[PDB]
Each structure stands twice: as C-alpha cells, then as structure tokens.
C-alpha cells in the first residue's frame, strides 16, 4: 500500500472531503507516521518477535571522508559519513547497512558507545563498522585503509520517521518517484487497522470541535463560537 | 472526545504484564 | 467465495446501494484485504496451527539473471530476480517456491538475512534459495551454477496483500481472469464472518456521520452540516 | 433438512416474505454456509471429538492423466486429477477418497506438503496418495503404474463450502438434484438452531436500516433517510 | 461510533494470556 | 444492532481456556 | 520533526488558530518541554532500558579556566569550566562530554558529590572529570596538568530542558538555526502521540473556561463571565 | 428480542467446566 | 414475562457443582 | 409478584453447600 | 412490603457457616 | 424507616467472626 | 440524618482485625 | 456537607495495615 | 469542588505498600 | 474538566508494580 491509500482513508473515515476543512492532509501525514512507531514500538519492544518485511526500508547513502575533529595531523585517523543526514533507526528490527547488495559484504551497524572501541581484536581489524552521530549523521569507522575507497551504500532498517526515510528511498528501475504520496508506507497490514483506528480517534474529537470564528479581537472558545 | 494514545499503551501494559505471569509459571520437570 | 461476493455482502450489509454513496467498494476491497491480513495474523502467530489451504495463495514469477551489484568482474556471482515486484508474504503458513508442479522440486524460501551464509555445507550446494529482498524483488542464489537457467517458478503463501497476489495470480486452465472482482478470495469460510462484521463495524459509524456539504469557504463540520 | 427449510426459516424469522425486501434468500444462502463453517470450526477444533455422520458429504470425481509440468520426458510420472476444481476440506473431519464403494479401497487424503514425499517406504509403493494442489484440483500420486488407470473415485469430507461440495454431489438413485434448495444441508440438528440464530442476528440490525433512497445525486445515510 | 480493530485484538491478546497461563499448569507425573 | 461472530468465538474461546484449565489439574494418583 | 510541527500540532487539535486567543503558542511550548522530561522519567526510570538517539541532544561547551575559590596560592588546584550554564541533564541515558569527536576522547561525566574524591588512583591520574556545579557550570577536574589547555567540547545526554539545550546546540554544517522552532524536537517518535494527548488534555478544559471580562473593578468569575 | 439457542449451550458448557474442576479435585486416599 | 424451565435446572446444576466441590474436601485422617 | 418456594429452597441449599465446605476442614489433630 | 421471618434466619445460618470456618482453623500446636 | 437491632447485632457477629478467624492464625513459633 | 456512634466503632473494629491479622504474620525466623 | 477528621484516620489506618502486611512477609534467606 | 491533597499521599501510600509487597517476593535462590 | 499529569503517573506506577510481582516469580530451576 502507498501513503495515498492509507491517507485517503482516514480522511474518508473522518469525511474530510471539503478543501476547506480545518485537518488537512498533512496533519493526517503527521499522525500516521508518529503513530506507526508507536505501534511498531509497543509490539515489537516487549519481548523479541519476527518482525516483518513490510516495517522495512532502504535508503542508499553517499559516503564522504571526513577528518575526525579537523585538519590536524594528531586529531586521530579519518572517517567516512554519509553525505546527507541519516534517519534514525528503532531498536525493534534489524539494522543493516549493506553495499547495494543485501547478500553480500559485512558491514556492521553498531552503537554510538561501543563504536569507541571497535577493532582491537586482531580478526576484527577488517570489519567496517557503523553509526549514527550526534551530529545526526552515519560515521563509518575500521582499521583497514581500504574502508576509505567506499562510495555508496544502503542501509535496511525499521526506520523511526517514514517521511524521511521515504524521502531517502533508493532509486527505483523507473526512477525516483517524486511525490511522497505515490512511495509505499512502511507498515504490516496487520497493523493498518489498528493505526487507522487510533488516528481517526485522534482526530474524531477535534473535528467537530469548536472555533474562535468571531473576528472581534477576543477570544471565543469559552462561548462555545 | 476521543484518543487513545495513553489507554492504548496501558492496556498493552497490562497484557504484557498478564504475559510474563502466565510464562513465569512454565516449567520443564525432572524426576521422571 | 470470489470477492465479488464478500464486496458486496458488506455493502448491503451497509446498504451503500445507491450510486451516489460516499464510501465506494474500494474502500470495502481496501477494509476486506488489510482486516484479511490482521485476523491472519491474530489467529496464526499466537502458537503454531494448521492453516487451511483456502488463506494460501499462489503467483507465476518469471526470472531474469542480474548483476549481484552491477557488471564488474570481482562484484560477485550473478542471482536470479523474479521480473515483478513479490507481494509479502505472512510468517504463519508453509511458504513454498515450486517448478510449477508442486509435488516436485526443491526450491527453498528462506529469510533474507539468512540467505547471505548460505551453501557452505558441502551436501547443500545443489539447492536453490529465495528471499525477498529490500529491492522487493525475489532474488535467487546458489551454488550449482544450472540454477540460472531456471526460467519461470510458482510462488505459494500466506500473500500479505491479497489484491497484490490475486494480480500476479497464475494463469488457468480457461485464462486469465480479467476482474478482481472475479478472483477467489483468500481466506478460510471459518474467519469470514469475524472479517465481515469487523469491517461493517468499520464503516458503520462514518456510514452516518455529517459532511461539509454546504460550499461557502467554510468548514461546517462542528456545526453537524 | 434441505437447503429450503433452512433458508426459509431464517427468512420468516425474519419476516422477509415481500418480493420487494432488500435481503434476497441469497444473502441467507451466503450466510448460512460460512456460518456453517464457523461453527464447525469453532466445536471441532478445540479438541478432537466425534464428528457425526450428518456434517459430511460425499462428491464424485472424474478423473484425467495428466503431465507433471508438460509433456517433456524428464519432467517426472504423470499424476492423475480430477476433472474440475475440489472444494477445500475442513481438517475437523474423516476425510476420505473412496472408489465409488466407501467400505472398500486404499486412497489416502494426506496434506500437499506430505505427498510431495511419499511412497520410498517399499512396502507403501501401492498407495494411492491425494491433495488439493493449490492449482485447486484434487492430484493423485502413486508409485504403482496401475493407478493411472482409474477413472472414478468419490470423496467423502466435511466440506469448507457446503454449496460447491453440493453443486459437485454424486447422482443419487432417483436422479440429480439440480435445484439446490432441494439438496440436504450438511450440518447436525444440534447445531442448527446456533446456526439461525446467529444468522438472524447477523441481518436483523441491517433488516431496519435506512437507506438512501432520494435520487438526487446525493448522500442520504447521514440524514436517516 | 464503532471501531473494533483494538478491542478485537486487545480481547484476543487477554485469551492468549489466560491460555497460556491454562497449558502452563499441564503435568505429566510420575511416581507410579 | 447486532452480530455475535465475533463475541461467539470470544465466549467459546473463554470457555475452552476454562476447559483446558479444568482437565489440567485431573491426576491418576499413585502410592496406594 | 521539529518544535514547529509538535507545537502547530496541538494548537490545530485545540484549534487554538485566532491570534486573538487566551493560550499562545509560549504555553504550548513549555508545556510539551516539561511533558518530554515527565514523559522521560516515566518511561525511562522504573527499570533500566534502550533510550535512542533521538531523544538524545548536543550541545557546545567553551572551556575557560577559573580559580577553584578565589586567586590565592592555597586555595587549591584551579579548574574549567564552561563559560556559560549548562543545563540539567536526565539519569537515565548516557550522558558524555566529547572533544568534538564522539568516537575518540574519554572525558568522565560523573556526580558532583564523588567528583570531591577523585583521581587518586595512581591509573586514573591523567581522566579529565565533570559534573554540574550548583552554580550551573560544568567544572572540570583532572591531575594531569594538560587538561587546563583543553578549549572547547561538546556534550550529549538527554537533557532536562530541550529548549535549554536546544539554545546551546552546536552549529551545523550550513550553520546557525536562529528559530528555535526550526531545531528538531528531543524525543522519539514513538512517545509524541502520549506528549500529544497529555498536553491537549491539558488545555481542554481551560480552553472553555470562563474569563473575568467586564471591566467593573470586580471578580466576575463567579458567576461565570 | 430473545432467542437463547447460544446462551444456552454457553451457560451448559460453563457449568460443564465447573462439573470438571469439582470431580478433578476427588481422590481416594491411602496410609491408613 | 415469565418462565424458569432453564433457570431453575442452571441453578440446580450449579448447586450440584457446589455440592460436588464440598464434598470432595472430606477427609477421614490417619496417623494418629 | 413473589413466590419464594425455589428462592428459598436455592438459599438454604446454598447455606447447606458452604456448611459442608465448613465442616469438610474440621480435623482432630495427632502428634503431641 | 416487610417480613424478616426468612431473611433473618438465612442471615444467621450465614454467619453460622462463618463461626464454624473461623473456629475450624483453631490448633493447639505442639513440637516446642 | 429504621430500626437496627438486627442489623447491628448481624453486624457485631460479622466482626466476630473475622476476629475470630484472624486470632486463630496465631502462633508462638519454635524450633530457634 | 446523621448519626456515626454506631458506624464509627464498626469501622473500628473491622480495622482491629485487619490489624491483628496484618501481626498474626509477623515471623523471626531460624535457621540462618 | 463535608469533614474529614474520621474518613482520613480510617484511610491511613487501612493503609498502616496494609503496609503491616507488606512488610510482614519480608524474609533474609539463608541456605546458599 | 477540587483538592487532591489528601487523595493524591493516599494513592501514593497505597501504591508504596504495592510497592513493597511486589518487592518482598523477591528472592535469590539456592541449591543449583 | 481534564488534566492527566497524575492518573498518568499512577496508572504507570501501578503497571510497575504489577510487572515487579509477575517477574519476581520468575527461577531458573534445578535438579535435573
């Protein structure tokens, strides 16, 4: 399913026809993609489940040596990143950044703690390790000089934000799909109704709520206007 | 009015926790 | 049952006859098959069960040989991708690729995590593998290279979607069937009444609800128009 | 009880006795026959217990050889199957494949993923083997060349669809039924009145429903119309 | 109004719990 | 309005869990 | 998402659109900042969990070296501390202060009461320590006199203020943020529909309340003017 | 309305299981 | 209306059941 | 209306059962 | 209306049943 | 109307009841 | 009306037993 | 009307009582 | 009208004794 | 009226409670 259906039906549930309704679209963009990690964090949080293929998504990530602190000589060895900020990943799935082919490399997609100290194992001086900054983007880090060669990656995973996810999708054999709505939405279908449901509960109370119609310079909610 | 992003976590709370009594009782014996 | 039937038992349960209804049997085709995956999934992932062969699902999938990233001599060995985008499937039932004779063939559905260490043990390098890949595609791989002759195999599952797995739905014995609405629907005799009282449950409240019907540039909602 | 007197009982206790009423003794057919299901599947699958005489029904089949995939050489035996489609069975029952005597014969109903592996046992190289391919025809499947050969077998089961198992019912001394309102229905007495009243149940809200009867070119579900 | 894609799930959930809390007490003793 | 198909499997369910429940605690004593 | 999508999201479900209106988007504002740390605290401080990234912030520190009491020669050894008040960080997550580089440097965040007791240990000489000082600064500690030339660092932790923190964030590679509605909001996207819901109860009530609006040198609320 | 074709086997099945529980609890005892 | 054809047979049943749990306790001890 | 010939008869057959669990718990006890 | 002619003595037969489970679980203990 | 000779002396045996119950758990223990 | 000299000591008395319950618990163990 | 110089006493005794039960199952194990 | 503080340290002290007594069932245990 | 800073609070804690005593019941057992 695509973002147009599922956005398309709440508003249908809701009955948010009228252009000139109070909720647009966007708010329901909004709530569906809060509300599908929501969902996605109280299912597959408590206890360890299989989690689907559906709640998955690729981006592809164009990597970029950069100096750890700056151009100094002692400021410690380089690290590639992504060019661009990545999305952050939930803990629920499973993580992998892959060389444009899932069936193939290792490359591994680690904490931000434990990336400090990675690879003084003498078998593990080879592994290219992975993760997301507080500067908001994806740091690689490994003590095998070809690591710096790389160029392109892309990352699987159950993504915190679809939006900007989706906005990072990869390309397609067509080619890029432009508008949001037409990108597929990232979510099992056992898990749809339940997030329609909460989303027109959401919205079902406001919608009929009232407004501070009067241009009066005052405040009209208290009389119910 | 209506919303159910509280109760809804709440509920799944209590499940869970109704989960892990009902599994804490599950026992492999011996003695056989 | 066809989805004719059950399309239309919900709309009269509604009584949505009339033409100009606001809510159209898409959105009951869209309810029927995301409520389909939802009671699926609620009934068979619990604890194991025997699924029916009624909620199984079968596709023709045809394969073309793809780069493993793209044409390079040292990318790796070449997979086998089926043309099409494969729908989902669901983790309850017995997935199964087959040669187009299902009492014959060995051809494995595994996941695609595990599809990467695969075929190291000497005694399963004849065996050929599938799992969906981020792409969305069904990607191939072995170790005996006869696998890429392969041309066309069979898809049987638990479908996520039913829509998506009824239009790639194989061919019969008569043709093809032109109309969805023509097709067999997914699902076991026993769980169709929970499916149709849980969408009529859906649509019952909004069936009745107030529109913005008045046109003054106005939302009228919170006044009950 | 026939199919009349089931239908009709449903109809007069819901009085639907004008020609000109908006649920037609299709809708009771329809949900006769998956409430049928329901219920047997609800009683019969908790625990194994005695299924009576009275839930089953028993079709003939005509028999073809055909090729395992096509007519090649090494596209393995040729498997025999019935001429058109077979309901699905419930697993509640006794299923049974007879030949034309039910207290005589060895063919064996086994599930398809089992028949994909039968008769290396040397001494069960003379069993006939049947399932319901997910092409949905019923494939026959032996080790004996004998078997191919038959041409006529009959199928004893609790039937997931009583209306197809009784479109597909064996000629009885008199001749054929062709009315199905003047076939048996396949269910215990015990289970009857369960079956009514949830089927009364199930029309009786939408039996005093609006609707939208106003022909002009408008939505009148909102208005109680 | 009416929605029962939560309580549908939330009432099964509850079964599954007790069900489980049900097999959990199953035995198969010995000492004959 | 009305429709059990979905409270009529809740309710057989419910008493299926009592079911099981009530032959759980059934044992063929030993020690005569 | 950022501050502006959160606050614009509970104004529009509150409806709170006239700029005529008692509750202004200040309200909304502090209201979500201190519902993020309720909510934090909730969730995180029960039992010991995975906090992400997302409800992790940054900010940047300069370091300036002061006397421990005043300029005298027995007061004691001097410190850094950051020139200006670092806000109140949450015991639930991973505070660390960084020299710019997350992945290199160990630089010790510890508790203000062991911070009195610290570096004895002839191994733990040369581990440069911090923690909050009543007076609001981050001060600085270490026996190994080269940690005073030490200028600038960075520190993440999930923060008891996001606007604080969010005023204090380090500069991005385009550069400053001037709006704090423009920087992205501290919390994970599986907690903002809770934060929603608390804070438009919150105001629910109050948006409806009766004002004293007659100006009559008088207490009007009374009678519920 | 009224039709009790669904309670009554409902409040039978019930009482059925509470029948159960009461003669699982029986035993005939020993070391006299 | 009025009619306890099925209510008067559940309350006796239930009784019974009461009956049976009652009864079942009784013990005639040993080892004295 | 009233008629308490079954109401009666059922609460004194209740009070009768909970007598029974009462007395079952009696024990005259050893080892001194 | 009011007769308590019934209701007093099922009353008393209750806390009866009551007095007889209280003063069941009375022990004189020994193995001091 | 009222008139509580009856409730109150049910009341005051209630209580001596659950006293009675609660004073029959006691224990001087051994065994130091 | 008003009047609490009788449901004051009832109250108390039901918080009596509450509390010599609640100590009739209280153990010092042996054996460490 | 409104006082609440009985109903406060009553809640803290009932919640002193509690708290009696609480901590009256505490136990330091020993038998490691 | 609206105060909740009294209600609010009651429902604290309630859930403190909930507190302590999930907490007095913990245990380490011995003999592996 | 509405504000649910505190029922929030207390629902949470009482889910804390309850998980507490459920996983408090959880052994790793012995003698195999």
Redesign the interface.
């Known amino acids: 399913m695509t973002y147009n259906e599922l956005i398309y039906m709440v508003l249908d549930e809701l009955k948010l026809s009228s252009d000139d309704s109070y909720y647009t679209p966007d708010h329901v963009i909004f709530l569906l993609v809060k509300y599908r990690s929501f969902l996605l964090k109280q299912r597959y949080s408590d206890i360890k489940k299989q989690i689907p293929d559906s709640d998955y998504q690729s981006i592809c990530l164009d990597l970029i040596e950069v100096p750890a602190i700056s151009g100094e000589p002692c400021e410690g060895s380089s690290y590639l990143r992504s060019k661009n900020k990545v999305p952050t990943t939930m803990m629920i799935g499973n993580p992998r950044v892959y060389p444009m082919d899932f069936y193939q490399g290792e490359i591994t997609y680690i904490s931000r703690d434990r990336m400090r100290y990675v690879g003084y194992n003498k078998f593990l001086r080879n592994i290219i390790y992975c993760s997301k900054a507080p500067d908001g983007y994806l740091y690689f880090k490994s003590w095998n000089p070809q690591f710096l060669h790389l160029e392109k990656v892309s990352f699987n995973a159950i993504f915190e934000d679809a939006k900007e996810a989706s906005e990072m999708a990869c390309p397609e054999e067509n080619g890029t799909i432009c508008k949001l709505e037409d990108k597929e939405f990232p979510i099992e279908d056992a898990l749809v109704p339940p997030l329609i449901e909460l989303v027109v509960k959401e919205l079902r109370g406001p919608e009929y709520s009232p407004k501070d119609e009067d241009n009066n310079a005052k405040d009209d909610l208290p009389d119910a206007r | 009015?209506?919303?159910?992003?509280?109760g809804?976590?709440?509920?799944?709370?209590?499940?869970?926790?109704?989960?892990?009594?009902?599994?804490?009782?599950?026992?492999?014996?011996?003695?056989?």
Chains 1, 3, 4, 7 share one sequence.
């Open positions: 009015f209506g919303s159910g992003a509280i809804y976590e709440f509920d799944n709370r209590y499940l869970n926790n109704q989960e892990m009594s009902a599994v804490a009782k599950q026992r492999l014996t011996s003695l056989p």
